[PDB]
Amino acid sequence: RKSVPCGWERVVKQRLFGKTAGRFDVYFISPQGLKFRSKSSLANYLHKNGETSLKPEDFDFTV
DNA sequence: GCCAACGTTGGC
DNA sequence: GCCAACGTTGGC
């Protein structure tokens, strides 16, 4: 399976109330502190910064 | 039918 | 006016 890319943090939070109670949200904090909620916005950032090692498939958005 | 990406909002 | 919660939904 997938592992957290180097210097990044993966935060998983489970919803407790409402219709979506039981659902999980996954977000990633970059080593620079930038908070990401989607694989799209992340893949977008990696492209603009010239990433040659970390691929958007390396960041698991499933829990 | 139902969930990825993003949208809204109550409660400071 | 911001943000951590949950809501909404297009499109697979």
Domain boundaries, chain A: 1-63
Q: Exposure of A60 by Cβ count < 10 A (0-12 exposed, 13-18 middle, 19+ buried)?
A: middle
Residue A9 has phi, psi (to 5 degrees) of -125, 140
β-bridge partners, A24: A14
For residue A24, the SS3 value is: strand
Q: Residue A50 CA to C3 C1' — how many Å?
A: 30
Q: How far is it, in rounded angstroms, from Cα A12 to Cα A52?
A: 26
Q: What is the resolution of this structure in A?
A: 2.5
Query: Å from A19 (CA) to C6 (C1')?
Result: 8
User: What ranges in A1-63 are assigned the alpha helix state H?
Assistant: 39-48
The CATH class of the A1-63 domain is alpha beta
Phi then psi for residue A11, to 5 deg, are -115, 120
Rounded to whole angstroms, how far apart are CA atoms A53 and A49? 12
Q: Give the distance, in angstroms, between the CA of residue A1 and the centroid of all CA atoms in the same chain.
A: 15
Contact A36, A45 (CB under 8 A): yes
Under 8 Å between Cβ of A26 and A63: yes
* A13 strand C contact, CB < 7 Å: yes
